Design a protein around this nucleic acid. Structure first.
Length: 1050
DNA sequence: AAAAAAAAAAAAAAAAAAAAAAAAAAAAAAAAAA
DNA sequence: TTTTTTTTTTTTTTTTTTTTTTTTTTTTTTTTTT
């Protein structure tokens, strides 16, 4: 009965054969569990029956239940009378139950029973070990806190929680309690050998079962190693250090030769070894001052051992853990002091602690194994596997996260600046993360910015983030200008997100940053000054940045359609105070900085809106009237301002006109074309302005005798007349028509060369300002005659005027239509470019640096605009590759790169003509130094050798060129350029060698049949073949200096 | 005013070359939801 | 304060077609004979 059983249990508890038999009989047939618990408390059939009853209960289930499972381990630990047969069933059922609130308690009870069974029996270690290992597939894939143990907010999976205690339960120190030190040494040796063998067995089986199915069975190890990392910092688990140690070497054996595995296995093992290395390096770094323990501080770390043991046994003893820790000291203890300490220990037997515990691990293998991990990481950095490289760089990054001074050694600097220049998207991202997490990364900022235009979106975004971080962090003006220039470059891209991010960060760091203070004193004098200095520095240094800055300031900041009205008044206000501060700085300062500030002011005035007021005009006036390049930017600012503002004072306008007309003879042509538009702009605000008419009439009367004479003062006179014509009086003939007639009169053959050039330049400028004048036949015939008269300087001024006209017209066209939203519900320049394209191309190949640069600039501008066909100019650019000058070659390379990226089909189509023209220019220019320069074919090859088929296509074009040419100097330069070509594949090289051998053999029979040129070209081809062979089924397998030698001929 | 054979020009079928699309797989980070 | 599902990036596997040739076939009109 239940009452009888309860009374019997109470009597047994108070006190502490027939009853056991009755309990067994009752269990055979809630009451059964109570009887089994009573029998267990009182205490092979009596045990075999309760075990079977518990097995049936567990099978059916899978507070009244838990007392039997709680009193079972006590009997197991106390009574060893259980035979080997009954132990197997309990071991197996409890191993099954351990894997798969009250359930956690049941699992803990099962773990306690398993460790008690391990401790009680010394001949069943392998049995329980294999039983626990056979259920390794039941580990949870995800580290959800629900099915996890504890022990600190540290969650431990149940399998290794049982396994670590089981392994540390060897506790040979207890044998020391049982006991001329001869027997204990042998016992300790046997115990340590047994533990070493079983830990190697566990590691081997874990790695084997992970290698069998690495993709699906990753968690089987992924948890374990990870948990081994979470438990290594606790002194309460010393055996864990061993578990990782023999494990780590196994991972180090993964990449050893004769152990080849799949790519996924390599990546997983590298991630695991990287985590292990990071953990052990973190442990090593956080130590005392002296932690050598390098097998060679000995007297005083026994005190550390004793303190650690005492603290462990004091707080949370867990007697198995401290028993194993006592054993761990045997290897260390086994000089005079060491012997005395060992004798004392034997006689006794017969935050700060966390740092102290790391000191004792240095003498062990785990901490000494860090160097092989680093060597393996460095070795794997250089392999061709992209995933391996990325994972290794990630491991280096997570290693350097703990210690920021790991970059001192040069073997990491070498890898980083080699990988920054050439890598893939993932590798570049990993190396950028590595350099960004480290505290100092200004040493490689140039390398980081060199990859700002990568194809991958992720690398570009991360580089932009690095640039923003550098701008926010550093204070050096040079690096700040560099990073802000890169950010401004990144405002145009094929990704809307990238350009939006760049615009947002630029707005935050140029406009909103100034708006934060909101007219707060003692803070605007620094941040606004720095921002204005940055903006001034942008407008220089590759003025494409200046163009992007103008675009950003005009078509983004001042467009009310782009952003909300409430977000536009702030922009306008910030720009107003910025302009006021810039004007004030210009006033007080009145050097390159001054020019930059003036350029910034001119750009601000040229904007779509006027942020300047009459007060700024009055402030600029005192040094405007007073008499450098100041008056040029000042005149530009005045011209831009007077086209938007009005309601000026009459007296001020009269004074401005007086001071402008007084200085007209003194000012040179450089700023006359801004002074005259200013004159007209100020004249139209002060109607009845006949004063400018009288001033123009004076110039006309002074110029009239000169034109009659045609049938130091004349230069300025004609310049002023042309300026008045093209900038004043736009409405019995019109003034500019009379000026064109006068210029045509002064542009005859009998006229002197200098005045003729000045007159033709002025006529070109006037026709540029008045397109209708280009329709007149006389000016067209004059321009054609100048272009076909072989004039060195007359053509140059026309080209410069056309360049200026093209720039102005394109700027006006871009400003006419910018960025806007259109709702349905709501050619002179091209003709001039096409007509004179041949003349420009012919002048591009001149031997004079100035004329060549002017012609190249005009050609580049025309090609960028797209007025004419690039096919007519593709060879010319290629001919510029033959130029010896480095700058001409570089600008030609940039132009050809742009032309390729636009029209690669036409570029490939015109390669033959380009090579022919380049060879002709090379032989024509340097009649004796023609073979000296041979750096045009290789640069063209690398430009068109970045594609999968661009290589074979370029080689096919090269073979066509070689066959076409089979002139002596042409063959010399072609051979010298071939000598410097890097060949992609050996099939191409052997084909070229066969062609050259056939050609030289044929020339050999030619010379034998037959003078100097033929033998010289034969010798040249033979020397090319010899140099090529001395530098570096067969055809199918093959598919996978020279100038001095040529000169030595004669 | 009658018949056969050969100069061919289009119109499909193969033998690859080559340039991207679909579709896991893996980290890495950020917005819900207990 | 943790786990959950989106959202974003390369990576690798095949799997697509879009080419560029080389073949054979088919039919067309012009040469040959009465």
């Amino acid at each position: 009965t239940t009452n009888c059983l309860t009374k019997l249990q109470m009597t047994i508890k108070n006190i502490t054969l027939l009853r056991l038999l009755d309990v067994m009989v009752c269990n055979i047939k809630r009451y059964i569990a109570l009887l089994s618990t009573i029998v267990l408390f009182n205490i092979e059939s009596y045990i075999m029956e309760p075990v079977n009853f518990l097995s049936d209960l567990i099978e059916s289930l899978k507070d009244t239940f838990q007392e039997a499972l709680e009193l079972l381990p006590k009997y197991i630990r106390n009574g060893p009378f259980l035979d080997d047969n009954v132990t197997a069933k309990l071991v197996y059922i409890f191993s099954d139950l351990l894997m798969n609130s009250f359930w956690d308690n049941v699992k803990r009870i099962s773990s306690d029973i398993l460790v008690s069974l391990f401790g009680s029996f010394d001949q069943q270690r392998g049995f329980i070990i294999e039983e626990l290992l056979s259920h390794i597939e039941k580990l949870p894939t995800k580290r959800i806190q629900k099915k996890l143990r504890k022990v600190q907010n540290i969650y431990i999976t149940d399998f290794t929680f049982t396994l670590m205690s089981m392994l540390e339960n060897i506790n040979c120190y207890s044998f020391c309690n049982q006991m001329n030190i001869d027997l204990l040494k042998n016992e300790y040796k046997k115990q340590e050998e047994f533990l070493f063998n079983i830990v190697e067995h566990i590691n081997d089986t874990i790695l084997e079962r992970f290698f069998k199915n690495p993709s699906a069975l990753r968690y089987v190890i992924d948890n374990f190693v990870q948990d081994l990392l979470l438990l290594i910092s606790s002194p309460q688990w010393p055996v864990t250090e061993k578990i990782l140690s023999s494990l780590l070497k196994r991972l180090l054996s993964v990449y050893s030769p004769s152990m080849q595995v799949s790519a996924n296995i390599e990546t997983i093992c590298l991630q695991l070894i990287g985590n292990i290395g990071s953990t052990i390096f973190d442990i090593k770094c956080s130590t005392r001052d002296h932690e050598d323990n390098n097998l060679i501080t000995l007297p005083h770390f026994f005190k550390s051992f004793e303190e650690c043991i005492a603290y462990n046994e004091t707080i949370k003893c867990r007697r198995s853990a401290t028993r194993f820790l006592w054993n761990l000291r045997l290897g260390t203890i086994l000089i005079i002091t060491v012997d005395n300490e060992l004798k004392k220990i034997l006689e006794q037997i017969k935050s700060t602690i966390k740092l102290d515990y790391f000191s004792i691990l240095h003498a062990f293998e785990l901490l000494n194994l860090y160097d092989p991990y680093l060597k393996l990481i460095l070795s794997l950095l250089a392999k061709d596997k992209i995933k391996l490289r990325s994972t290794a760089i990630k491991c280096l990054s997570m290693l350097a996260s703990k210690d920021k001074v790991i970059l001192s050694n040069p073997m990491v600097k070498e890898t980083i600046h080699r990988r920054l220049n050439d890598s893939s998207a993932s590798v570049k991202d990993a190396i950028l993360d590595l350099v960004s997490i480290n505290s100092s990364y200004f040493e490689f900022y140039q390398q980081i910015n060199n990859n700002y235009n990568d194809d991958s979106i992720m690398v570009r975004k991360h580089v932009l983030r690095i640039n923003e971080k550098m701008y926010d962090e550093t204070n050096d003006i040079v690096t700040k200008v560099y990073v802000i220039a890169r950010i401004l470059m990144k405002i145009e891209d094929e990704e809307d997100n990238i350009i939006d991010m760049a615009r947002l960060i630029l707005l935050n760091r140029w406009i909103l940053k100034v708006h934060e203070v909101l007219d707060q004193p003692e803070k605007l004098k620094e941040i606004s000054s720095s921002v204005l200095l940055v903006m001034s520095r942008v407008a220089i240094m590759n003025e494409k940045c200046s163009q992007l800055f103008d675009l950003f300031l005009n078509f983004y900041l001042l467009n009310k359609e782009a952003h909300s009205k409430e977000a536009y008044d702030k922009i306008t206000h910030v720009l107003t105070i910025l302009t006021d501060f810039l004007v004030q700085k210009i006033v007080e300062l009145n050097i390159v900085d001054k020019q930059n500030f003036l350029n910034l002011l001119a750009k601000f005035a040229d904007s779509t809106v006027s942020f300047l007021t009459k007060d700024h005009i009055t402030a600029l006036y005192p040094y405007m009237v007073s008499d450098s390049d100041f008056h040029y930017y000042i005149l530009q600012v005045f011209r831009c301002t007077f086209e938007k503002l009005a309601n000026f004072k009459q007296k001020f306008l009269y004074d401005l006109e007086t001071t402008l007309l007084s200085r007209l003879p003194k000012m040179n042509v450089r700023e006359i074309d801004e002074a005259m538009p200013l004159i007209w702009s100020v004249a139209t605000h002060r109607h009845d302005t006949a004063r400018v008419a009288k001033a123009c009439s004076s110039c006309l009367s002074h110029l009239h005798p000169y034109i009659n004479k045609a049938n130091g003062k004349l230069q300025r006179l004609i310049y002023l007349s042309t300026g008045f014509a093209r900038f004043c009086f736009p409405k019995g003939e019109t003034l500019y028509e009379h000026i064109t007639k006068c210029l045509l009169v002064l542009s005859k053959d009998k006229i002197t060369h200098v005045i003729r050039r000045v007159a033709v330049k002025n006529l070109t400028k006037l026709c540029g300002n008045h397109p209708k004048l280009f329709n007149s036949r006389h000016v067209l015939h004059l321009l054609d005659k100048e272009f076909q008269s072989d004039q060195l300087d007359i053509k140059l001024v026309i080209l410069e005027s056309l360049y200026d006209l093209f720039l102005l017209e394109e700027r006006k066209s871009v400003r006419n239509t910018g960025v806007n939203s259109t709702l349905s519900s709501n050619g002179v320049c091209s003709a001039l470019a096409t007509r004179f394209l041949d003349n420009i191309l012919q002048l591009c190949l001149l031997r004079d640096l100035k004329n060549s640069l002017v012609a190249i600039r005009l050609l580049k501008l025309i090609l960028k605009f797209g007025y004419t066909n690039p096919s007519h100019s593709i060879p010319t650019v290629i001919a510029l590759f033959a130029s010896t000058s480095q700058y001409i070659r570089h600008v030609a390379y940039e132009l050809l790169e742009d032309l390729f990226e636009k029209y690669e089909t036409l570029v490939f189509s015109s390669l033959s003509r380009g090579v022919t023209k380049a060879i002709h220019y090379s032989i024509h220019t340097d009649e004796k130094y023609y073979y000296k320069h041979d750096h045009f074919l290789s640069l063209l090859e690398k430009l068109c050798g970045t594609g999968k088929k661009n290589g074979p296509k370029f080689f096919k074009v090269l073979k066509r060129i070689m066959q076409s040419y089979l002139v002596q100097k042409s063959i010399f330069v072609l051979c010298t350029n071939i000598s410097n070509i890097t060949f992609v594949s050996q099939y191409d090289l052997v084909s070229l060698l066969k062609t050259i051998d056939l050609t030289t053999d044929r020339l050999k029979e030619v010379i034998m049949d037959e003078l100097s040129g033929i033998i010289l070209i034969q010798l040249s081809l033979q020397d090319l073949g010899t140099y090529l062979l001395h530098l570096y089924e067969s055809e199918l397998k093959n598919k996978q200096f020279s100038a001095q030698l040529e000169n030595i001929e004669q």
